[PDB]
Amino acid sequence: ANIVGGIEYSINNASLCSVGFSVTRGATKGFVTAGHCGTVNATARIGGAVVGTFAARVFPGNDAAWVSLTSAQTLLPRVANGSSFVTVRGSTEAAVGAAVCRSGRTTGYQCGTITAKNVTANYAEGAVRGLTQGNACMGRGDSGGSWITSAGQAQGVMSGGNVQSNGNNCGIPASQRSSLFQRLQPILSQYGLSLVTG
């Protein structure tokens, strides 16, 4: 499969999440995603085919993981924006106030602004700390997906948000949305990963 940020993958033929970013770990191909999407050794599929397994994760506390892929997978420096792509250029962290977008298999490509940093989310499994908050909307299934600026700087991976009864927060105003991502930089250093850029 071609590995693009925001696309759907399944975990142990059960849950669905979204790809974060193509990365390498030496010769090993991979993608980063959210920790809550799978446990270590869980099997990832795209297009019905096995593409790899969860190599490592931290969740809760953080919400980070990477999936180590078979050598047959094709890593791409891209994030889905409808039928087009945003090119991944780097991982410079944007400041509060910056515009930012996110990509995932439920609500697609959505934009907003970064409204706060170092936010704690309390999930059923425990607290997750250090999250960045934006007001781009999102929904169930968008987890793991890319957060990236329009200029191509990869920010993080979708962790959670204040979804409403319809499964997303796209039906309430931006001012009322809390959409939270796990920062990319600590995932890269934690697992010795390098971002695929183009």
């Binding site: 987890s143 204040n162 979804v163």
Partner: peptide, 4 residues
Amino acid sequence: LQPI
């Protein structure tokens, strides 16, 4: 996930 949903913050609670």
